[PDB]
Curated annotation (Swiss-Prot), chains A, B:
Shielding domain as annotated region, ranges: 205-306
Sequence segments annotated as region (Hydrolytic domain): 1-204
Amino-acid biosynthesis in keyword set: no
Keywords tagged on the record: Cell membrane, Cytoplasm, Hydrolase, Membrane, Metal-binding, Phosphoprotein, Zinc
Protein name, UniProt field: N-acyl-aromatic-L-amino acid amidohydrolase (carboxylate-forming)
Record-stated family: Belongs to the AspA/AstE family. Aspartoacylase subfamily.
Subcellular location field: Apical cell membrane; Cytoplasm
Annotated GO MF terms: aminoacylase activity; hydrolase activity, acting on ester bonds; identical protein binding; metal ion binding
Function: Plays an important role in deacetylating mercapturic acids in kidney proximal tubules. Also acts on N-acetyl-aromatic amino acids.
Length: 306, 306
């Protein structure tokens, strides 16, 4: 017995300077008709109102790192980070996280300065999320739509969409922070429409046959070359720059130092760098994430049991 | 009798999140040998230290709008904008503005999210600045190097380089704020080297023959389409996006509204839009600047009179 997804949210402005989500959320709050389907209506939400008003990523702390049960469960004070306070409000709205009152699904919208194109980031290999990616791929022949599987190191999930029972992040790049490109705005807008379409089909009892697909699974990060003071001593090499999801073999160049030397990848295996040179990641000490490209088998999601 | 340029500054980080200038200044402060020529040594300066540390454009007020004689001459208080306070310090260092103690030349480094490529911005048609552009063009066949003439509306100049007797801005895009691309870092680094080379030749008494060249002269700005509340109602049209310095004829599309309508250019004449969709300009109400492409005749700069 398939349970329909009836309480569905689309969050924009989780990071205040990521403009597609910001303006789609603002627009939908004024024009919700677009998020309505026969079986359900998705609720638009501006996730970080103060960061959005200020057009910056966050005020005190990254909102997308503030939604752990520890943060949500903590006893409020006045001296809490704004984003911690806002996380609690999203917990009331979309959760509480880990309980049966949580929303069925949260779609969280993101932009990156990296040349990722269309990427879905999933914190688990839940088969519904893989079918969703597959659906978007099929709906857009010739458009890459890649799934980046980013499982939490251990126990606690951190993100805005993790508040809901399930959720996914739709990330689109490249786009400078604080800039709204018409091309990415429209494309993101159409892909959200398609994601809602998919939830409707699901809700209507559509059978989703098992299938196989390539996904990219996180191996971990590589930091920028630094001085003994952790200041940049170089940046991403021109031959790596803008080459997200392309293979990176050992011995290939990954940085150019200001001194003019090349730094080479010293790994044992070919990997697939993603989120190469993202502005928000400098302070997280991440020049890029290494991923392994793996072919997974996705079980069927059928209305009835065969 | 030609006066040599002996007190020459290169400023980076005038805007704290414009990374080429930030990292070139930081690097040169550690490795000044690069800025030395036989006749002079250029002083590297991080223009906005606090904005740079915070990786944002400015703290209180745009530093590059804070260097008017009015601001510089004002009586200090504790409640002055940080950037006003910093402007006064740059006035002490590189000026005082309008006096004989000012530096001979300030080269101010900038990055834009607009697809400008290499642009020199000059606040006057001083012939030395035009020869400099011409020199850079000749030194880089096949590389656009365009001169954008931006004369102050009326009396008071506002910018960091206006503190010196003469100066120019070297702007390079596209680059997201807070991102350092190896390609733009290297190119900017080589162009600064060439600008210093040029000052050396000048200093050595080189004759600079009169010549003609196309420049782009500011006509003014066009703001983003807005609601009655001044919130975006659209963004730069995909056909205009990334087309800086290309001709824009009346009737051509300049915006796409969220409602799906196109907004068309209603001007009487063909213009050349520049700084199309710059992040820092949203709040200045500027989607792009209109310029006229005009061919000017540049007088000779000769060691002796013919
Ligand atoms: Cl499917
Ligand atoms: Cl990239
Ligand atoms: Cl010349
Ligand atoms: Cl542009
Ligand atoms: Zn984001
Ligand atoms: Zn700037």
């Amino acid at each position: 017995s398939r349970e329909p997804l009836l309480r569905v949210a689309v969050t924009g402005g989780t990071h205040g300077n990521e403009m597609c989500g910001v303006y789609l959320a603002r627009y939908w709050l004024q024009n919700p008709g677009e998020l309505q389907r026969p079986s359900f209506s998705a609720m638009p939400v501006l996730a970080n109102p103060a960061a959005t008003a200020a057009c910056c990523r966050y005020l005190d702390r990254d909102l997308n790192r503030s939604c752990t049960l520890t943060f949500l469960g903590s006893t409020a004070t006045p001296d809490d980070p704004y984003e911690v306070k806002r996380a609690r409000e999203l917990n009331q709205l979309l959760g509480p996280k880990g309980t049966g009152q949580a929303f069925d699904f949260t779609l969280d919208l993101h932009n990156t300065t990296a040349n990722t194109g269309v990427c879905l980031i999933s914190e688990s290999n839940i088969s519904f999320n893989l079918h969703l990616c597959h659906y978007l791929q099929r709906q857009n022949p010739g458009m890459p739509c890649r799934l980046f599987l980013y499982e939490p190191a251990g126990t606690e999930t951190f993100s805005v969409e993790s508040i809901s029972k399930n959720g996914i992040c739709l990330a689109m790049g490249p786009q400078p922070q604080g800039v709204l490109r018409a091309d990415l705005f429209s494309r993101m807008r159409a892909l959200v429409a398609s994601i809602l379409d998919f939830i409707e089909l699901f809700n209507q009892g559509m059978d989703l046959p098992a299938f196989e697909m390539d996904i990219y699974r996180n191996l971990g990060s590589v930091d920028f070359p630094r001085t003994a003071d952790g200041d940049l001593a170089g940046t991403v090499h021109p031959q790596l720059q803008d080459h997200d999801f392309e293979p990176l073999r050992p011995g290939e160049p990954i940085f150019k130092l200001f001194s003019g030397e090349d730094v080479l990848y010293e790994g044992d295996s070919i990997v697939y760098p993603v989120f190469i040179n993202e502005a928000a990641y400098y302070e997280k000490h991440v020049a890029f994430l290494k991923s392994e490209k793996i072919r997974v088998t996705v079980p069927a999601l059928l209305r009835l049991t065969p």
